[PDB]
Amino acid sequence: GPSFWLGNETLKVPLALFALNRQRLCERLRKNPAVQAGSIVVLQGGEETQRYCTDTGVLFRQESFFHWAFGVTEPGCYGVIDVDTGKSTLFVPRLPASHATWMGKIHSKEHFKEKYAVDDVQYVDEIASVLTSQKPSVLLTLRGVNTDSGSVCREASFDGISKFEVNNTILHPEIVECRVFKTDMELEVLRYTNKISSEAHREVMKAVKVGMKEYELESLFEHYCYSRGGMRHSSYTCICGSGENSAVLHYGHAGAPNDRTIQNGDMCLFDMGGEYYCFASDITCSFPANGKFTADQKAVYEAVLRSSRAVMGAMKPGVWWPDMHRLADRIHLEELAHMGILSGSVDAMVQAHLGAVFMPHGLGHFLGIDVHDVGGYPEGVERIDEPGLRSLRTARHLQPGMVLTVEPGIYFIDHLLDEALADPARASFLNREVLQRFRGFGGVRIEEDVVVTDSGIELLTCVPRTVEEIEACMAGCDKAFTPF
Amino acid sequence: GPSFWLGNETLKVPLALFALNRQRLCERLRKNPAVQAGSIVVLQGGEETQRYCTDTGVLFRQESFFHWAFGVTEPGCYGVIDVDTGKSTLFVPRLPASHATWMGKIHSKEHFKEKYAVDDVQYVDEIASVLTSQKPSVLLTLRGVNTDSGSVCREASFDGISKFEVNNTILHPEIVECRVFKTDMELEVLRYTNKISSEAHREVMKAVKVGMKEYELESLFEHYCYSRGGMRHSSYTCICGSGENSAVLHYGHAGAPNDRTIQNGDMCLFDMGGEYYCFASDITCSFPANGKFTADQKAVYEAVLRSSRAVMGAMKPGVWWPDMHRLADRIHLEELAHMGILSGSVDAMVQAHLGAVFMPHGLGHFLGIDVHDVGGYPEGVERIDEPGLRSLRTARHLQPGMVLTVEPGIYFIDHLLDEALADPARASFLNREVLQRFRGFGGVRIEEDVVVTDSGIELLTCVPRTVEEIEACMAGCDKAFTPF
Ligand code: PRO
Ligand code: PRO
Ligand code: NA
Ligand code: NA
Ligand code: NA
Ligand code: NA
Numbered sequence: 001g002p003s004f005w006l007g008n009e010t011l012k013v014p015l016a017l018f019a020l021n022r023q024r025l026c027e028r029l030r031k032n033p034a035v036q037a038g039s040i041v042v043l044q045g046g047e048e049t050q051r052y053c054t055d056t057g058v059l060f061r062q063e064s065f066f067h068w069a070f071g072v073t074e075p076g077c078y079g080v081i082d083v084d085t086g087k088s089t090l091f092v093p094r095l096p097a098s099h100a101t102w103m104g105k106i107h108s109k110e111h112f113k114e115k116y117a118v119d120d121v122q123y124v125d126e127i128a129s130v131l132t133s134q135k136p137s138v139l140l141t142l143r144g145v146n147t148d149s150g151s152v153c154r155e156a157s158f159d160g161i162s163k164f165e166v167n168n169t170i171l172h173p174e175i176v177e178c179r180v181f182k183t184d185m186e187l188e189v190l191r192y193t194n195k196i197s198s199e200a201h202r203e204v205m206k207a208v209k210v211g212m213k214e215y216e217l218e219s220l221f222e223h224y225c226y227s228r229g230g231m232r233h234s235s236y237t238c239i240c241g242s243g244e245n246s247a248v249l250h251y252g253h254a255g256a257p258n259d260r261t262i263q264n265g266d267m268c269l270f271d272m273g274g275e276y277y278c279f280a281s282d283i284t285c286s287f288p289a290n291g292k293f294t295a296d297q298k299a300v301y302e303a304v305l306r307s308s309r310a311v312m313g314a315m316k317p318g319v320w321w322p323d324m325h326r327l328a329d330r331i332h333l334e335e336l337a338h339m340g341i342l343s344g345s346v347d348a349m350v351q352a353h354l355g356a357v358f359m360p361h362g363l364g365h366f367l368g369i370d371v372h373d374v375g376g377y378p379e380g381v382e383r384i385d386e387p388g389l390r391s392l393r394t395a396r397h398l399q400p401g402m403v404l405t406v407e408p409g410i411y412f413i414d415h416l417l418d419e420a421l422a423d424p425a426r427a428s429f430l431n432r433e434v435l436q437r438f439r440g441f442g443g444v445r446i447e448e449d450v451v452v453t454d455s456g457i458e459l460l461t462c463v464p465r466t467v468e469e470i471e472a473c474m475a476g477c478d479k480a481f482t483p484f
Numbered sequence: 485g486p487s488f489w490l491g492n493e494t495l496k497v498p499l500a501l502f503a504l505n506r507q508r509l510c511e512r513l514r515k516n517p518a519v520q521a522g523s524i525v526v527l528q529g530g531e532e533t534q535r536y537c538t539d540t541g542v543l544f545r546q547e548s549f550f551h552w553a554f555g556v557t558e559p560g561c562y563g564v565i566d567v568d569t570g571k572s573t574l575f576v577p578r579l580p581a582s583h584a585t586w587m588g589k590i591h592s593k594e595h596f597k598e599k600y601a602v603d604d605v606q607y608v609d610e611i612a613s614v615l616t617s618q619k620p621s622v623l624l625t626l627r628g629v630n631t632d633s634g635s636v637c638r639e640a641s642f643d644g645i646s647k648f649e650v651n652n653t654i655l656h657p658e659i660v661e662c663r664v665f666k667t668d669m670e671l672e673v674l675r676y677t678n679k680i681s682s683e684a685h686r687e688v689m690k691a692v693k694v695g696m697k698e699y700e701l702e703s704l705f706e707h708y709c710y711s712r713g714g715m716r717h718s719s720y721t722c723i724c725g726s727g728e729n730s731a732v733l734h735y736g737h738a739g740a741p742n743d744r745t746i747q748n749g750d751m752c753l754f755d756m757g758g759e760y761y762c763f764a765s766d767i768t769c770s771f772p773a774n775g776k777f778t779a780d781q782k783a784v785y786e787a788v789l790r791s792s793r794a795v796m797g798a799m800k801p802g803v804w805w806p807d808m809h810r811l812a813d814r815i816h817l818e819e820l821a822h823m824g825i826l827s828g829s830v831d832a833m834v835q836a837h838l839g840a841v842f843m844p845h846g847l848g849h850f851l852g853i854d855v856h857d858v859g860g861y862p863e864g865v866e867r868i869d870e871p872g873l874r875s876l877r878t879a880r881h882l883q884p885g886m887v888l889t890v891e892p893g894i895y896f897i898d899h900l901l902d903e904a905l906a907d908p909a910r911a912s913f914l915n916r917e918v919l920q921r922f923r924g925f926g927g928v929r930i931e932e933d934v935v936v937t938d939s940g941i942e943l944l945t946c947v948p949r950t951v952e953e954i955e956a957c958m959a960g961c962d963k964a965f966t967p968f
Contacts, residue, residue: 006743007697048738052530052547054854055633059721060738063536074739100899101844104732104740149539213491216711223707227700232741237543248588254532254544255558256588257716259490360585370538415584483707484687 001117004071004277006230011192013277015117017185018071019088021178025069026086028174029140035170037084038137043069044156045077061233064369065142065153067278068179072116078127078156079118082134087119089130094123128160138165144172147377148365148393173378179368180375181401186279186368187451190403193281194449194460196229197273201285201463203481204270205473210289214240214258217270224481225274235280235371239271242289246442247411249361262289267297267442269409273371280371282405283461284447291474293467296437300410301444303335305465307408308446311363315406316456319398322389325363328408329355329388336410340434349429356388357420360413364405365393367449373403402452403460411443485601488555488761490714495676497761499601501669502555503572508662509553510570513624518654521568522621525655527553528640529561545717548853549626549637551762552663556600562611562640563602566618571603573614578607612644622649628656631861632849632877657862663852664859665885670763670852671935671942674887677765678933678944680713681758685769685947688754689957694774698724698742701754709758719764719855723755726773730926731895733845746773751781751926753893757855764855766889767945768931775958777951780921784894785928787819789949791892792930793968795847799890800940803882806873809847812892813839813872820894824918836910840872841900848889849877851933857887886936887944895927932968943967 003012029035046063050056060075070079070090078091090113095106109121122130131139141155155168182190200221207220218238225231240258241251246269252258262268266289273281286304288297307328314324333349336342336358342349349355366373376394377383384395398404417435420426446465451458464473487496513519530547534540544559554563554574562575574597579590593605606614615623625639639652666674684705691704702722709715725735726746730753736742746752750773757765770788772781791812798811817833820826820842826833833839850857860878861867867874882888901919904910930949935942946967948957953965 006699007745046536050633050635051545051854053630053633053635053637054548055630055635055856056720056854057734057737061535064538073741097899101897102733103737104729104735146537146539149534149537151534151537151539153537213714215490215714215716219707219710223703223711226703230697230699232699236540245588249586250541251588253541253587257557261491370535370540372539413585415581483704 002115008230009228010230011189011276013071013189014185015071015115017183017189018069019117020183020185021068022081022088023086024178024183025175026081026083028178029083029170032170032174035083035140036137038135039083039140040131040134040136040138041081041083041171042131042139042141042156043079044158045070045072045079046075048075059232062278064278065175068175068369070116070118071277076124078124078158080131083140089120089122090116090118091122091124091127094125127158128163131164136164138167140171141166141168142171142175143168144176146374148372176375176378179373180366181399182368182403182451187403189276189279190281190367190449190451191460193231193274193276193279194283195462196225196231196276197281197283198462199228200224200274201270201272201283202473205285205287205464205470206476206478208262208268208289208474210262210264212262214242214245214252214260214262218252218258218272221270221272222274223483229274229276231274231276233275235273235275235282239269241269241442242266244440244442246286246444247413264290265294267444269443269445271445271447278369280367280369280373282367282371282447282449283463284407284445285463286444286446287470287474291471293471296441298467299335299339300441301467303332303339304408304410304444304446306335307331308406308448311406311408312448312450312457312459315398315450315452317399317452317454321363321398322384322392322395325389325392326350326355328363329359332358332408332410340431341438342429343431344429352425352429353387354420354426354429356386357416357426358410359388359408360391360411360416361409362388362392364407364447367403367405398452400452400454403449404452405447405449407445407447409443409445412438412441414439486599492714493712494714495673495760497555497673498669499555499599501667501673502553503601504667504669505552505662506565506572507570508667509659510565510567512658512662513567513654516654516658519567519624520621522619523567523624524615524618524620525565525567526615526623526625526640527563528638529554529556529563530559532559543716546762548762549659552659552853554600554602555761560608562608562642564615567624573604573606574600574602575606575608575611578609611642612647615648620648622651624655625650625652626655626659627652628660630858632856660859660862663857664850665883666852666887666935673760673763674765674851674933674935675944677715677758677760677763678767679946680709680715680760681756681765681767682946683712684708684758685754685756685767686957689769689771689948689954690960692746692752692773692958694746694748696746698726698729698736698744698746702736702742702756705754705756706758713758713760715758715760717759719757719759719766723753725753725926726750728924728926730770730928731897748774749778751928753927753929755929755931762853764851764853764857765933766851766855766931767933767947768891768929769947770928770930771954771958775955777955780925782951783819783823784922784925785951787816787823788892788894788928788930790819791815792890792932795890795892796932796934796941796943796968799882799934799936801883801936801938805847805882806868806876806879809873809876810834812847813843816842816892816894825915825922826913827915828913833913836913837871838904838910838913840870841904841910842894843872843892844875844895844897844900845872845893846876848891848931851887851889882936884936884938887933888936889931889933891929891931893927893929896922896925898923
């Protein structure tokens with residue numbers, strides 16, 4: 001069958017991937033006792049947008065549920081799936097003649113049917129008529145709450161839909177649950193996004209020089225990913241934190257736009273991941289700007305390397321993700337005590353939630369078509385109201401096919417440290433005279449992407465990780481990638 | 485005073501630029517008979533957005549009118565200007581403590597006052613109280629129609645605004661008119677955006693090889709612009725049309741995403757321009773993929789070079805822009821006849837609107853904070869209802885301080901050519917035996933950015949343009965060219 005491909009060495013993604021997702025969705029819906037025979041899933045694709053009131057077009061990236069089901073790159077589409085038969089119909093815009101002048105070839109419906117391997121293609125202006133003739137019992141539309149944004153996913157609508165019976169409650173939890181478990185075809189794409197992003201991270205480590213701006217490495221990363229990987233988008237805005245900025249978890253946004261000069265002695269924390277055909281990656285590498293770890297940098301870094309590998313070594317089906325978060329906390333506290341930043345009973349530190357002072361974010365999250373992927377908190381799974389753990393993007397138990405980031409870190413964040421020092425229950429553990437040396441250190445985060453397997457995990461990421469590996473990588477002479 | 489700067493060799497942009505814009509706006513409003521004493525201009529800045537219902541942040545780019553007035557890069561702001569005194573107040577978001585962890589330093593109001601050189605800074609939730617205490621006669625808000633998108637610009641609103649007298653008709657045409665005329669400080673930035681984008685176009689011409697994907701050059705262009713120019717954004721999505729795709733005017737969007745393999749014998753038409761601190765550039769270079777113009781390619785290319793230079797040579801204050809469009813049409817028709825593609829009376833060809841078959845778009849447009857900048861069709865300026873001319877983005881007369889693109893082109897667009905061949909009023913001019921040779925040629929566009937001056941124009945763009953200059957550049961030559 002047909003495949004998506006951007007040529008050269010980029011990955012061929014079979015459109016059969018999306019056909020399988022549609023099949024899996026139907027199979028799950030058929031098992032739901034509330035779903036009536038003759039139901040039709042109706043999804044609305046993303047539309048083209050502009051900057052504010054201007055005619056400046058924004059590059060179109062497909063809505064994630066619609067992509068998951070259909071893999072369609074064009075704006076203005078709808079897609080439907082007959083639940084009982086699995087038959088798929090794509091609706092494409094009926095374009096005006098001038099499209100041929102300004103935008104490109106006006107493809108036929110047959111072209112799209114062949115391109116996407118759906119059962120039928122019709123024009124968008126005919127959706128009401130086509131759905132009417134199919135005599136559905138109910139239209140199943142998509143509405144639910146994203147548990148990372150808190151936003152409500154907005155259901156499909158079209159002129160004439162009011163003539164139909166519409167249910168907007170059944171679909172969302174079911175299609176979310178399908179997205180949580182990656183097919184082998186999806187895993188091949190995530191292996192690829194991790195491959196290219198790993199290569200790009202390595203090029204960045206090789207290219208970093210004292211005196212560069214953070215954004216020069218953001219630029220290089222995205223250039224490698226696009227030109228060599230066909231990744232036109234990043235999965236999220238690149239986080240290129242040097243020095244104290246490495247303590248800022250989502251650094252790099254418009255308000256703090258990767259505009260610091262990298263200085264001798266800085267730690268770098270680069271959290272970047274290219275996106276291919278709307279599939280994510282998310283990798284974080286931490287390393288000394290000047291290519292040589294100081295003793296303090298080595299100690300902090302190897303603490304996070306220890307929790308990283310301990311968590312990965314413990315992950316397997318049945319493991320409760322919050323237990324892995326707490327494992328990382330305990331290891332960080334042990335290591336920080338060995339360094340002399342902390343003193344006392346680590347058991348007592350844990351009871352006082354001291355780990356969250358140093359790692360205020362969740363250990364890791366589902367990853368897929370969205371970098372913070374759906375399904376972390378389905379009905380019945382509750383958010384734990386404790387420091388650190390409350391930022392976990394899932395409290396589920398691990399099962400095969402789940403894809404997770406594993407991203408422990410240790411940071412020196414002034415307002416968290418100061419809070420802790422004011423609290424007698426935590427302050428006794430902190431050795432101020434030692435901690436003072438680490439103010440402005442920033443932080444270390446080591447982020448791998450992994451798949452849960454029957455017996456443990458598969459590691460998707462491949463970057464240097466030991467102190468020796470990193471120093472060797474940065475000292476490498478290889479001009480494998482030299483723009484200009 | 486303070487400056488915007490991204491370090492290295494990037495341009496320092498004084499915040500005095502925006503203070504001057506505010507002053508110019510007030511001065512214009514004070515002369516406006518509809519404006520009362522005690523009026524306050526109220527603008528609302530752009531807000532942060534996400535992809536659909538996800539928490540995937542979209543990189544924030546400021547709304548263009550708000551940028552013009554304040555130069556503010558942070559999302560969630562408002563800004564007001566007291567018309568009678570020119571006093572400026574910036575309203576910034578009151579951030580949650582957790583911002584310090586995830587997003588970065590929670591800057592003081594004084595930090596922002598100093599950063600932006602405004603007269604006062606307040607928190608956004610205090611805007612109703614602050615405005616109330618000033619006892620304004622009327623709030624002047626922004627509402628009007630963009631004549632390129634047809635969209636209505638969104639006026640500012642805040643909780644409590646209903647307690648004020650609000651006028652939303654006066655401001656838009658006045659602030660648009662200010663934007664039409666660039667200050668010397670604004671011209672410094674547009675000189676810079678053209679410098680970097682010109683350098684990037686030159687790097688692309690040096691790097692292009694047969695067998696590359698179009699998007700590899702898009703990536704390279706953007707990487708040059710960001711890493712060397714500090715241009716995090718492009719002004720619009722890169723148009724990298726090879727072969728037949730060079731006849732597609734806005735090629736490169738999601739539906740036609742720069743994914744063709746460049747072939748020997750192809751013409752390339754690359755329309756790309758980096759954006760610096762929300763100031764545009766827009767440059768188009770046309771060249772043979774293999775670095776050597778064929779005779780046919782040379783002929784089409786030099787026809788557009790002739791119209792380009794004729795227009796630039798004719799432009800000066802008082803010139804009616806549609807007359808320049810018609811001048812380009814006439815030159816294209818003359819040269820196409822000189823090539824044997826057309827025969828007969830060129831006067832008659834013009835009368836038959838034959839020029840629009842080969843150049844279906846407008847000769848050029850205002851450029852500024854938006855690539856298709858505001859103010860092309862103010863009240864009283866009408867769109868000309870003829871092929872080609874109706875696509876003009878302005879029908880104004882040129883005056884000093886206007887910035888325009890000059891972008892004639894010749895394309896071989898099958899459905900337009902076939903229309904002409906079916907039309908007895910046009911068909912006899914076309915020589916099919918020669919024209920058949922140019923089917924699938926694509927097209928040539930040569931686009932310069934220029935400023936209208938007292939004596940003529942100032943050319944901002946600096947790329948190779950003659951056949952010899954282009955072949956030299958592609959062969960790797962250092963500035964082997966001299967501008968018009
Ligand atoms: O947002 C999250 O969950 C992770 C934590 C650090 C950056 N990304
Ligand atoms: O949109 C416009 O006006 C010009 C014409 C060619 C591409 N950009
Ligand atoms: Na991360
Ligand atoms: Na992550
Ligand atoms: Na253009
Ligand atoms: Na243009």
